[PDB]
Amino acid sequence: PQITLWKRPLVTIKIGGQLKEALLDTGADDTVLEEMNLPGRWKPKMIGGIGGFIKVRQYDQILIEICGHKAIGTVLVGPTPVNIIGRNLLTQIGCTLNF
């Protein structure tokens, strides 16, 4: 689908057997999700934004269905205000910007 930007580009995702809403964020290099249990091992990581830095758990090879499009990649879980789908996953579903 084509999405206009007059409202927040939120989409439904299926991850870890849970349904959530996430923001397709072209300004984010990485996918960051609010707290959950992504099954398997992780490695501590620190990520930064406009306001400073937050501590997240880095989970690799996580399956995520973004509006029915399947993708596996690194997913960081931590105190983000909002779920954000980053460019690591957006490339996999073939998402593009169009003026």
Ligand X SMILES: CCC(CC)CN(C[C@@H](O)[C@H](Cc1cc(F)cc(F)c1)NC(=O)O[C@H]1CO[C@H]2OCC[C@H]21)S(=O)(=O)c1ccc([C@H](C)O)cc1
Using CB under 6 A as the criterion, which residues of the chain lie in contact with ligand X when the complex forms?
A: 25, 27-30, 32, 47, 49-50, 76, 80-82, 84, 86
Phi-psi region at 38: left, alpha or beta (left = phi > 0; alpha = psi -120 to 50): beta
Choose between 41 and 99: whose C-beta lies nearer to a second copy.
Answer: 99
**CB under 5 to 8 A by kind: which of ligand X, a second copy, none does 30 bind?**
ligand X
Q: Which is nearer to a second copy, 41 or 52 (CB)?
A: 52
Residue 89: in which H helix or E strand, if any?
Answer: helix 87-90
Q: Is 29 a catalytic residue?
A: no
Measured between alpha carbons, how far is 96 from 99 in angstroms, rounded to an integer? 10
Distance CA 38, CA 59 (A): 7
The residues in 23-82 that bind a second copy, with binding defined as CB under 8 A, are 23-29, 32, 47-54, 67, 69, 80-82
